Design an enzyme around this catalytic site. Sequence first.
Site, PDB file in Angstrom:
ATOM      1  N   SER A 133      37.621 -29.669  44.473  1.00  0.00           N
ATOM      2  CA  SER A 133      37.528 -31.066  43.800  1.00  0.00           C
ATOM      3  C   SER A 133      36.469 -31.203  42.806  1.00  0.00           C
ATOM      4  CB  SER A 133      37.261 -32.271  45.191  1.00  0.00           C
ATOM      5  OG  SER A 133      36.007 -31.649  45.739  1.00  0.00           O
ATOM      6  N   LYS A 149      30.376 -35.434  52.421  1.00  0.00           N
ATOM      7  CA  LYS A 149      30.660 -36.071  53.705  1.00  0.00           C
ATOM      8  C   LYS A 149      29.453 -36.397  54.349  1.00  0.00           C
ATOM      9  CE  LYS A 149      35.170 -36.385  53.209  1.00  0.00           C
ATOM     10  NZ  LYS A 149      35.425 -35.192  52.575  1.00  0.00           N
TER      11      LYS A 149
END
Lengths: 5, 5, 318, 318
Positions: free
Chosen positions: D273, D50
């Site tokens: 993830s 991110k």
Amino acid sequence: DGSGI
Amino acid sequence: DGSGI
Amino acid sequence: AAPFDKSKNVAQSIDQLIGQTPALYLNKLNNTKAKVVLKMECENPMASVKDRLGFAIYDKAEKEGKLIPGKSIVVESSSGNTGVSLAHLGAIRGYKVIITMPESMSLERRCLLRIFGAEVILTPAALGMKGAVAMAKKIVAANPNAVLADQFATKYNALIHEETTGPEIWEQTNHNVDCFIAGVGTGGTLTGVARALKKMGSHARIVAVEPTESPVLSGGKPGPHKIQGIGPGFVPDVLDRSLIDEVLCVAGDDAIETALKLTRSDGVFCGFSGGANVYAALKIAERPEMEGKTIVTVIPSFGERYLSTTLYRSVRDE
Amino acid sequence: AAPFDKSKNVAQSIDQLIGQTPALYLNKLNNTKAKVVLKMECENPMASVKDRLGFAIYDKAEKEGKLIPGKSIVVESSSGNTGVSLAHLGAIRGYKVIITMPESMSLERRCLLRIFGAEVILTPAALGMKGAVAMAKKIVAANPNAVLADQFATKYNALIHEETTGPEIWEQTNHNVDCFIAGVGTGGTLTGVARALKKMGSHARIVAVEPTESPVLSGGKPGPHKIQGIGPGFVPDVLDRSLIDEVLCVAGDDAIETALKLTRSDGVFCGFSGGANVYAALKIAERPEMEGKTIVTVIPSFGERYLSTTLYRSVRDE
Ligand code: NA
Ligand code: NA
């Protein structure tokens, strides 16, 4: 510290 | 989750 | 450690991603007329400078024939990043790792090592770090396959920094360093970089940082202090004191304050020793003789490992 | 985002250290005849992918005139890494940041954002993530200077991955990708990389990963799941589903198991993830048609941020 190393 | 993003 | 082109090639193993770390000018926090360069050892794969030492111990000891995967057992007493890096690289490389530390250490410290499959031996809380050191020595004395990582004395520690950290700094600064400052834990970073710089013909001043509360290099008494990662309470055999132009003491509270200011000012998120090193760099940068000069220091470890510690306790009541 | 030579130059600001991340072959854990390449987005300055989205929002919105430092207030509802990256870069760049999240979130999540000086607004626990989303919308509706970061819909998200992540992968793999696999959170990583690869003439198959317990792309009902960072419970506007050849569901428990095996086998330390993406890559790599082929996937975030979570809870009783 602690020994921290 | 949570939205987790 | 031959220059390996990371932004451009695919590594065969994560240990090729150790070192070759970025360098960053200090910006908002630097209000002086000197340039301050941070060597970002927080950006190593397991988030601290000790990744270089870990790799040098496995790589060099294997090549010398001292470590044999599947047989040698690597032991060390560490409640900090050397344990982490030894546990990470021993997992990959087929070595059992035993790290000793007092039982009163935080869950985060024990948990990170157990994630990489190291055996953590917890020694009685009342015996402190000396009890953990004594247990690691006992293990290595009793077992022919057990060897101490020996962080404070191994010849591999200053060498890896002379072969990698220092030449990186030299390339990144375009062969222009007036002062190199680093807190001494094992002393490997300061020793190896200072050697590299001197061989390249640099007249940089070399400055060792230690805690005001444990001013052993300066000549004072060892004692307990806040600055995790430095101030071992003795002069490590790795450290070559002949290379040092100045020992600068930094108080634990100045280190703490600086770490928090750095996150907000420059976005650098580090531990207590990165705040000490920057506090020291800013002190030297205030000296009028350092106008237009380049001071290089180190950010030894990333901040996320310190969330559970004292370091960011102030944030709560702000 | 012009290629910036990090191992070799000194950055002016930490945002120049975002992206240009390493790529690593999966080794011990890969028992197949296919090659599996991990794009190591855990190595970004604030330890997840991110950071690219954060930078693209500040950089691009400023250049368009939508964000004005000292005046615009950036708001987002996030209990994960988008909040972290927005709080980190807003601090440096002179923007007030407001992140909303439920009051039942862990101290670690709130603390990391407050370290970078963001305002965290905690919304009633019983309202869940919807209560935090509703509060962020209310703030942006009420205040002319407040703007939503809008992670699930911003045009900046797929673009930054088309301009940086994808061309990096293309260079690192020597212009040879047979399959690109990535869990979809906002969908930016899969969309932007898939676009870049197709423009370069790659015939790579594009595979989206989602939680078995929230198989929304597949056609099933949204629901709560373990895989932090993906499975938003809806189809984000960022995601271009026309680019996807296959949606592969991975169960939360397979993601968890894989994350722990990866640390011990390859030394890659990641979140839920990253374990889902590797579990998926290994599934595709088992398909006989993928012999000698290159499958690229992503390790979105570094593991240290998950120590307090469910992810490594097993380590305790081992
Ligand atoms: Na022995
Ligand atoms: Na508004």
